[PDB]
Amino acid sequence: APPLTLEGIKDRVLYVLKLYDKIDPEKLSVNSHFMKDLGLDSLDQVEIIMAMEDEFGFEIPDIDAEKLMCPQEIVDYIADKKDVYE
Amino acid sequence: DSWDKDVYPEPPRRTPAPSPQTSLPNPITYLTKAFDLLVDRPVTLVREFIERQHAKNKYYYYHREFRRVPDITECQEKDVLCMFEAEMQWRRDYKVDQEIVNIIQERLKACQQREGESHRQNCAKELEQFTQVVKAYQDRYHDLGAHYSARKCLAKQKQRMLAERKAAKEA
Amino acid sequence: FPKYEASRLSSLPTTLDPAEYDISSETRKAQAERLAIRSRLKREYQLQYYDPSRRGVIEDPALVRWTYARSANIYPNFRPNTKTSLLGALFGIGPLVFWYYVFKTDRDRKEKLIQEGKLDRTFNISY
Amino acid sequence: ITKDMLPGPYPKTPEERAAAAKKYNMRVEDYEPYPDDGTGYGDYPKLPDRSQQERDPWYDWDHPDLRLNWGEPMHWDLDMYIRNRVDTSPTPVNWNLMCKHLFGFVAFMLFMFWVGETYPAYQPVGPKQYPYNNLYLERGGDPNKEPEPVVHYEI
Amino acid sequence: AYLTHQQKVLRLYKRALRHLESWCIHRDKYRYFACLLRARFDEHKNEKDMVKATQLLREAEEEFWHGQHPQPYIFPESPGGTSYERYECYKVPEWCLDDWHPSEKAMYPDYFAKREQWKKLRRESWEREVKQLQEETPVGGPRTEALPPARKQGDLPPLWWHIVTRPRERPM
Amino acid sequence: SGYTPEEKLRLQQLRELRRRWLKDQELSPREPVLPPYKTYRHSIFAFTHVLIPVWIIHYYLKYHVTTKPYTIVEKKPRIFPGDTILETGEVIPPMKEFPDQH
Amino acid sequence: MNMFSSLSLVTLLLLTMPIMMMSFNTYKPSNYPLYVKTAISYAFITSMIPTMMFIHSGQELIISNWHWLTIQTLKLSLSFKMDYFSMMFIPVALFVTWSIMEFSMWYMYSDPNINKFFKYLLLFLITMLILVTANNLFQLFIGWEGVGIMSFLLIGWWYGRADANTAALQAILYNRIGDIGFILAMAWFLTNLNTWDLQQIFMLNPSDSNMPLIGLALAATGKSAQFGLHPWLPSAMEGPTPVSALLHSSTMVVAGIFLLIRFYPLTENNKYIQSITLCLGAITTLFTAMCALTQNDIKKIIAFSTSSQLGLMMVTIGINQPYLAFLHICTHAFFKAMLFMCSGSIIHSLNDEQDIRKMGGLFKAMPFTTTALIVGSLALTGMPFLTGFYSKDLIIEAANTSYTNAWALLMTLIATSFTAIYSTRIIFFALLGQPRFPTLVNINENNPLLINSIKRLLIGSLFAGYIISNNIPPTTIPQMTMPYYLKTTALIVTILGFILALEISNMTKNLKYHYPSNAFKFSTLLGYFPTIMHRLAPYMNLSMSQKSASSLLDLIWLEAILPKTISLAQMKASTLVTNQKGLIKLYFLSFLITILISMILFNFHE
Ligand SMILES: CCCCCCCCCCCCO[C@@H]1O[C@H](CO)[C@@H](O[C@H]2O[C@H](CO)[C@@H](O)[C@H](O)[C@H]2O)[C@H](O)[C@H]1O
Ligand SMILES: CCCCCCCCCCCCO[C@@H]1O[C@H](CO)[C@@H](O[C@H]2O[C@H](CO)[C@@H](O)[C@H](O)[C@H]2O)[C@H](O)[C@H]1O
Ligand SMILES: CCCCCCCCCCCCO[C@@H]1O[C@H](CO)[C@@H](O[C@H]2O[C@H](CO)[C@@H](O)[C@H](O)[C@H]2O)[C@H](O)[C@H]1O
Ligand SMILES: CCCCCCCCCCCCO[C@@H]1O[C@H](CO)[C@@H](O[C@H]2O[C@H](CO)[C@@H](O)[C@H](O)[C@H]2O)[C@H](O)[C@H]1O
Ligand SMILES: CCCCCCCCCCCCO[C@@H]1O[C@H](CO)[C@@H](O[C@H]2O[C@H](CO)[C@@H](O)[C@H](O)[C@H]2O)[C@H](O)[C@H]1O
Ligand SMILES: CCCCCCCCCCCCO[C@@H]1O[C@H](CO)[C@@H](O[C@H]2O[C@H](CO)[C@@H](O)[C@H](O)[C@H]2O)[C@H](O)[C@H]1O
Known part of the structure; x- marks a missing residue:
């Protein structure tokens, strides 16, 4: 399987969020808090995590998932699990 | 040849001559010729070399002959010196009889393979001979136990002889 | 929805347990101390697990x-009483007596057939 | 280790129950010893008879394969509940209902097989006929005895 | 349960969607039914009565048990998946390298030179890491498994070795 | 629900250490420092894995196994009506005439 | 006989040389997998020469080359029976193993222990050939348990995985339970016939052969995973896909059927055994196919297909058609190994994904894997003139024109329809519809090793059945006259299954949600047999081991009634003897008592 990179993981994390109708793709950034900045709720955040699992083909446990609150946090979580260091 | 054809009999061989009914070449014919050329010839010469060295050093070994001694019937009770010889002789005969049953079993199994689908009718002599020898072996040695001896064998025979006598008396 | 009939080998899901819900400050206090005990043991383990100079095994008292x-501890706490003796009598003596009659009856039946000549042993010369 | 930290006899007072629970790293409330039937458990804690498969996969265990933490009391039957052995995790079908359906299917299959053995299926055909007194010699019949002839006719 | 009410609802939502996905299979059909399922959660989103909210959770869990897929989808490397623990046989602890024969170490002069710096870095930091845990831990031991960060420059977060040096998820 | 400030800082610090450890796992160009046609390859394979073994096996079978009784037992050849026996020259009679119904 | 006997032994000696070179460190560790693959290719060639000789004139022989041990009147020799069943199976097994090994070279490329993997695959095959050519029951038993142990080591290949260790041990458990019957058969044959050699058993032809054959049926039940001992084969899916291909097509699971085939001279005369095996196979073929209808793991579907096909072979045994059962063993080997290899191609391209719900849209993305998958499926469902039609179709027509249990015939037919249904499932979900896999597409089936290994088995799945049926000699009277509806029963129930399966598959697309039926759950959870039995039996036996065997008896009662009671009595007596006052008055007063009782009671003074 082709290796992952920090830039590659970030691109796909943002890519998925730009296909979510509840986010504004222009206002989105790696550091956008899903509630404070993007104004989503927690039911929406579960769906975002669910979509990240489907994007990368592995599961984030609910204990870990509820803390990933901005795109950069997801990118960091995936990189740590997959041993991505660039 | 190598063994005795009387002890291990083989019925005469009957091989049908080839009757090719096809224009095609037979693969087995040429592979056979290749096998003789590539395998049989080199293997044959290597053996003939070894058979030359053996012929230059010919020496012999013998099959031991065991004189017959008095059996356990002729031994006085608790006379170990006579019992020992009769006991050892009986043990030697026990091993030989075991190999007799093996020979008859080997004939039976060779016949079953040789005759193929016809073995049921063409191995009746072998089966009959096997059935009789197994009856004789069973009568001599069966049920003696791990600690068998010439004495236990004799006691088993006497018991059998007694039963046959009594039935004969009923006749 | 037919309810959940839990068994020994098919436990009850926590999601269907009333005990999980209807929490009280008394229970929450209990979960607090359980977690505190866990963390005390985790800390004591981690301090030895992470020690650079430790080569060996971390003996676990548990x-x-x-x-x-x-x-080693079973016999001091054993008592000969009705429960232990009835169980001991059933599972220690009982199976031996059972198997005795099974084999003795089978061997006796076969022995009679051999004497009367009614058991076939035409080719039986290996024993 | 030391005798004061090893398992002991059945606890007989609220205070002996407190020292036992302390010894096994438990709360005096959560510690409950096996009944004192004289079977030799002593003061060893009786723990919820649950398989190790039931424990949280995602928690960071000291022994991830056993799903145990260093120092926590081990179930008396821990070796029977490892993930390789007895699993007690909840089933999507109740235990008893599972038994009824599996038993019912098997029992029904066996009954129908007997019914099919009493009423066998066959074609409307007479017995297959063989020559030479039903191949008497081939099957192994005695050459010396003269078999009862078996005659087959056309139709 | 140490999970708050919010955690239970969010966990049930995720678990219900995944089992719904197993039933539907097809992505368009799943999208249609996931939205109806979300609508049901949105219906009681503002229920301010805890007693009713808890009661709604109980029935929801009861309904999920009846409707759960008997063979749900599992990510291959997730607990219970077909690749769970598939690579544990290849993960070898780093302390196994201290036992290598010198002729084995001579083949990787650069790797074992770096490894020595890490081992040197581990010895130097240990004393301060034990000290930091001593000063921050209340009498009566810790109450949670959370660990502190480093508070100064040149300090490493206490108890870091076995997290930093753990085997790669795809070692060999 | 997110990370606490204390947690985020610890995750940050472990991450830099881990990524540095993973970076150090890479091999340098000179590592490892080791110490000091088809027909032909299939021809050498056939020689050493077929011809030499079949030489040994034929020698074994011909001059050791077959010199003992009943070590190799062949099913006797099938004889069909009209066959001729090589050993003797005996000719097996044909079967009697059929009704020739077709 | 010189060429025939020489060549059939080099075949076996050839396969062991890579084992010998390996364990003797004389090899070239560079490309050992290619060396092992090359040896298997050459052994296929050498095994074709004896097979052609048998095809020509029916030449068969027995080779007893080494006398190992004589036990009084039982001589045990290393013997090899090169007969009908050995000469056809050996080239087929080697041909399929040739493809699997080439396929494994690509599938296992990244495995660090690939050299050990190929060594185990070679031992797996060697023990199968010992099983197939064994002429006596002891030599056969060596192969019998060899494949079981090799199966254990390969199923549990990823030994850090608890689930793989449970599956590997479970396979031993179920196969050892079967081995009770094998030992029983050996004991009966030695006692009653004084032999283990197949020749003497058949010549003596026992009439009261109920006990030995029940033992053989029990052994076949475990090895071929018939109902009662079946769960281990689906669980054996833990192993790498190449293991599943070889485990299911050749080597292990077929040995059970082969054992019963080898003993057809006995079974053909015992109607009671025929009735039992027929029912045993019928429930097996029906139940396992019923379980495949709802499985979502692609390997578990094919695993349940094998159990269903093995049940069919057991049915063929039950109707006194040993040679058709053998033919199905041979034809089944081709397309079943291909199906497993095709699924491996899909699993690899989808980053280790095995759930069909997460595939789809692969019909065009993986064209060559798709062609092989369709050919394999059609061969499995008895499509006319594909390899699977020449065995399966004859079996069905012999089944419904025989004197048979009516229920077993009806079960067998329904399972034939189920075969089309679960075959439709794999194609519909893996290949058709829209893709359901993750976004990073890495589909790639362009490795020549993958293409060639499947290509060879694809040709076999098209012509191997035709070639074999036209070359094997006839050993029965094939039944060819029958009513039109009995002739076409196999074809029509297959077509009906395809039609119905298609309708069921299409309903998944509709925007409807349905609660599961008890029947649906029953199929999915494998009739609850693994769920109930793999918790109840382990629990009861393991709990008795600790509670009663150890504690109650060994740590308590066996101690109490002897050492602990005796030592306590001695301690008590010691205290009575030694607890004295040391008083002169008391000791001498006891002397007076001793003297008095000496005269009055015991009359020691007389
Ligand atoms: C510790 C495990 C406890 C399990 C229970 C075990 C009980 C064991 C009982 C020992 C056997 C007692 O029974 C024993 O049977 C044998 C037959 O073989 C008898 O043997 C004798 O009697 C038989 C007929 O009865 C005659 O052939 C002959 O007189 C002699 O063989 C013994 O006279 C008798 O004492
Ligand atoms: C193609 C397949 C060909 C072979 C088909 C074989 C059919 C086998 C059918 C076996 C049925 C056995 O299962 C049987 O089902 C009914 C229906 O739930 C069960 O019934 C049980 O569940 C419910 C309770 O909620 C009630 O029906 C009843 O109170 C209870 O007994 C029986 O307890 C069970 O014994
Ligand atoms: C009782 C035994 C009787 C026969 C004994 C004959 C001994 C002959 C030994 C020949 C070498 C065997 O050992 C091994 O053989 C193979 C092919 O020959 C060689 O392997 C070579 O060819 C194979 C395939 O062509 C390649 O996979 C491999 O990359 C290459 O090195 C090994 O380098 C050698 O170590
Ligand atoms: C021995 C080998 C036997 C091989 C038998 C092979 C299959 C035999 C044909 C089975 C039926 C063919 O398929 C028949 O026609 C069309 C397919 O275009 C189906 O039509 C279906 O196609 C679309 C697919 O998107 C569905 O969404 C729609 O519900 C339906 O109209 C019919 O529902 C079916 O009855
Ligand atoms: C089976 C038929 C023949 C059996 C003959 C056996 C005779 C007895 C041999 C062992 C004698 C040992 O004598 C003594 O036994 C007791 C327990 O049994 C041991 O003592 C141990 O067990 C006892 C009671 O379980 C405890 O009170 C004690 O605290 C403990 O140390 C002694 O350390 C040992 O010295
Ligand atoms: C078939 C005949 C077999 C004869 C075997 C030879 C017998 C030898 C007998 C030695 C007896 C002395 O052994 C003595 O047993 C008692 C067990 O009650 C032990 O006593 C132990 O158990 C008792 C009570 O269980 C405790 O009160 C005591 O504190 C403890 O030490 C002694 O420590 C040991 O010294």
């Missing part, structure tokens, strides 16, 4: 107690 419980 494991020593388990193995010691399931061998």
Whole structure:
């Protein structure tokens, strides 16, 4: 399987969020808090995590998932699990 | 040849001559010729070399002959010196009889393979001979136990002889 | 929705347990101390697990107690009474007596057939 | 280790129950010893008879394969509940209902097989006929005895 | 349960969607039914009565048990998946390298030179890491498994070795 | 629900250490420092894995196994009506005439 | 006989040389997998020469080359029976193993222990050939348990995985339970016939052969995973896909059927055994196919297909058609190994994904894997003139024109329809519809090793059945006259299954949600047999081991009634003897008592 990179993981994390109708793709950034900045709720955040699992083909446990609150946090979580260091 | 054809009999061989009914070449014919050329010839010469060295050093070994001694019937009770010889002789005969049953079993199994689908009718002599020898072996040695001896064998025979006598008396 | 009939080998899901819900400050206090005990043991383990100069095994008293419980400690706490004796009588003596009659009856039946000549042993010369 | 930290006899007072629970790293409330039937458990804690498969996969265990933490009391039957052995995790079908359906299917299959053995299926055909007194010699019949002839006719 | 009410609802939502996905299979059909399922959660989103909210959770869990897929989808490397623990046989602890024969170490002069710096870095930091845990831990031991960060420059977060040096998820 | 400030800082610090450890796992160009046609390859394979073994096996079978009784037992050849026996020259009679119904 | 006997032994000696070179460190560790693959290719060639000789004139022989041990009147020799069943199976097994090994070279490329993997695959095959050519029951038993142990080591290949260790041990458990019957058969044959050699058993032809054959049926039940001992084969899916291909097509699971085939001279005369095996196979073929209808793991579907096909072979045994059962063993080997290899191609391209719900849209993305998958499926469902039609179709027509249990015939037919249904499932979900896999597409089936290994088995799945049926000699009277509806029963129930399966598959697309039926759950959870039995039996036996065997008896009662009671009595008596006052008055007063009782009671003074 082709290796992952920090830039590659970030691109796909943002890519998925730009296909979510509840986010504004222009206002989105790696550091956008899903509630404070993007104004989503927690039911929406579960769906975002669910979509990240489907994007990368592995599961984030609910204990870990509820803390990933901005795109950069997801990118960091995936990189740590997959041993991505660039 | 190598063994005795009387002890291990083989019925005469009957091989049908080839009757090719096809224009095609037979693969087995040429592979056979290749096998003789590539395998049989080199293997044959290597053996003939070894058979030359053996012929230059010919020496012999013998099959031991065991004189017959008095059996356990002729031994006085608790006379170990006579019992020992009769006991050892009986043990030697026990091993030989075991190999007799093996020979008859080997004939039976060779016949079953040789005759193929016809073995049921063409191995009746072998089966009959096997059935009789197994009856004789069973009568001599069966049920003696791990600690068998010439004495236990004799006691088993006497018991059998007694039963046959009594039935004969009923006749 | 037919309810959940839990068994020994098919436990009850926590999601269907009333005990999980309807929480009280008394229970929450209990979960607090359980977690505190866990963290005290985790800390004591981590301090030895992460020690650079430690080469060896971190002896676990919980494991020593388990193995010691399931061998050396049984007899001191044993009592000969109705439960232990009835179980001892059933599972120690009982199976032997059962198997005795099974084999003795079978061997006796076969022995009679051999004497009367009614058991076939035409080719039986290996024993 | 030391005798004070090893398992002991059945606890007989609220205070002996407190020292036992302390010894096994438990709360005096959560510690409950096996009944004192004289079977030899002693003061060893009786723990919820649950398989190790039931424990949280995602928690960071000291022994991830056993799903145990260093120092926590081990179930008396821990070796029977490892993930390789007895699993007690909840089933999507109740235990008893599972038994009824599996038993019912098997029992029904066996009954129908007997019914099919009493009423065998066959074609409307007479017995297959063989020559030479039903191949008497081939099957192994005695050459010396003269078999009862078996005659087959056309139709 | 140490999970708050919010955690239970969010966990049930995720678990219900995944089992719904197993039933539907097809992505368009799943999208249609996931939205109806979300609508049901949105219906009681503002229920301010805890007693009713808890009661709604109980029935929801009861309904999920009846409707759960008997063979749900599992990510291959997730607990219970077909690749769970598939690579544990290849993960070898780093302390196994201290036992290598010198002729084995001579083949990787650069790797074992770096490894020595890490081992040197581990010895130097240990004393301060034990000290930091001593000063921050209340009498009566810790109450949670959370660990502190480093508070100064040149300090490493206490108890870091076995997290930093753990085997790669795809070692060999 | 997110990370606490204390947690985020610890995750940050472990991450830099881990990524540095993973970076150090890479091999340098000179590592490892080791110490000091088809027909032909299939021809050498056939020689050493077929011809030499079949030489040994034929020698074994011909001059050791077959010199003992009943070590190799062949099913006797099938004889069909009209066959001729090589050993003797005996000719097996044909079967009697059929009704020739077709 | 010189060429025939020489060549059939080099075949076996050839396969062991890579084992010998390996364990003797004389090899070239560079490309050992290619060396092992090359040896298997050459052994296929050498095994074709004896097979052609048998095809020509029916030449068969027995080779007893080494006398190992004589036990009084039982001589045990290393013997090899090169007969009908050995000469056809050996080239087929080697041909399929040739493809699997080439396929494994690509599938296992990244495995660090690939050299050990190929060594185990070679031992797996060697023990199968010992099983197939064994001429006596002891030599056969060596192969019998060899494949079981090799199966254990390969199923549990990823030994850090608890689930793989449970599956590997479970396979031993179920196969050892079967081995009770094998030992029983050996004991009966030695006692009653004084032999283990197949020749003497058949010549003596026992009439009261109920006990030995029940033992053989029990052994076949475990090895071929018939109902009662079946769960281990689906669980054996833990192993790498190449293991599943070889485990299911050749080597292990077929040995059970082969054992019963080898003993057809006995079974053909015992109607009671025929009735039992027929029912045993019928429930097996029906139940396992019923379980495949709802499985979502692609390997578990094919695993349940094998159990269903093995049940069919057991049915063929039950109707006194040993040679058709053998033919199905041979034809089944081709397309079943291909199906497993095709699924491996899909699993690899989808980053280790095995759930069909997460595939789809692969019909065009993986064209060559798709062609092989369709050919394999059609061969499995008895499509006319594909390899699977020449065995399966004859079996069905012999089944419904025989004197048979009516229920077993009806079960067998329904399972034939189920075969089309679960075959439709794999194609519909893996290949058709829209893709359901993750976004990073890495589909790639362009490795020549993958293409060639499947290509060879694809040709076999098209012509191997035709070639074999036209070359094997006839050993029965094939039944060819029958009513039109009995002739076409196999074809029509297959077509009906395809039609119905298609309708069921299409309903998944509709925007409807349905609660599961008890029947649906029953199929999915494998009749609850693994759920109930793999918790109840382990629990009861393991709990009795600790509670009663150890504690109650060994740590308590066996101690109490002897050492602990005796030592306590001695301690008590010691205290009575030694607890004295040291008083002169008391000791001498006891002397007076001793003297008095000496005269009055015991009359020691007389
Ligand atoms: C510790 C495990 C406890 C399990 C229970 C075991 C009970 C064991 C009982 C020992 C056997 C007692 O029974 C024993 O049977 C044998 C037959 O073989 C008898 O043997 C004798 O009697 C038989 C007929 O009865 C005659 O052939 C002959 O006189 C002699 O063989 C013994 O006279 C008798 O004492
Ligand atoms: C193609 C397949 C060909 C072979 C088909 C074989 C059919 C086998 C059918 C076996 C049925 C056995 O299962 C049987 O089902 C009914 C229906 O739930 C069960 O019934 C049980 O569940 C419910 C309770 O909620 C009620 O029906 C009843 O109170 C209870 O007994 C029986 O307890 C069970 O014994
Ligand atoms: C009782 C035994 C009787 C026969 C004994 C004959 C001994 C002959 C030994 C020949 C070498 C065997 O050992 C091994 O053989 C193979 C092919 O020959 C060689 O392997 C070579 O060819 C194979 C395939 O062509 C390649 O996979 C491999 O990359 C290459 O090195 C090994 O380098 C050698 O170590
Ligand atoms: C021995 C080998 C036997 C091989 C038998 C092979 C299959 C035999 C044909 C089975 C039926 C063919 O398929 C028949 O026609 C069309 C397919 O275009 C189906 O039509 C279906 O196609 C679309 C697919 O998107 C569905 O969404 C729609 O519900 C339906 O109209 C019919 O529902 C079916 O009855
Ligand atoms: C089976 C038929 C023949 C059996 C003959 C056996 C005779 C007895 C041999 C062992 C004698 C040992 O004598 C003594 O036994 C007791 C327990 O049994 C041991 O003592 C141990 O067990 C006892 C009671 O279980 C405890 O009170 C004690 O605290 C403990 O140390 C002694 O350390 C040992 O010295
Ligand atoms: C078939 C005949 C077999 C004869 C075997 C030879 C017998 C030898 C007998 C030695 C007896 C002395 O052994 C003695 O047993 C008692 C067990 O009650 C032990 O006593 C132990 O158990 C008792 C009570 O269980 C405790 O009160 C005591 O504190 C403890 O030490 C002694 O420590 C030991 O010294």
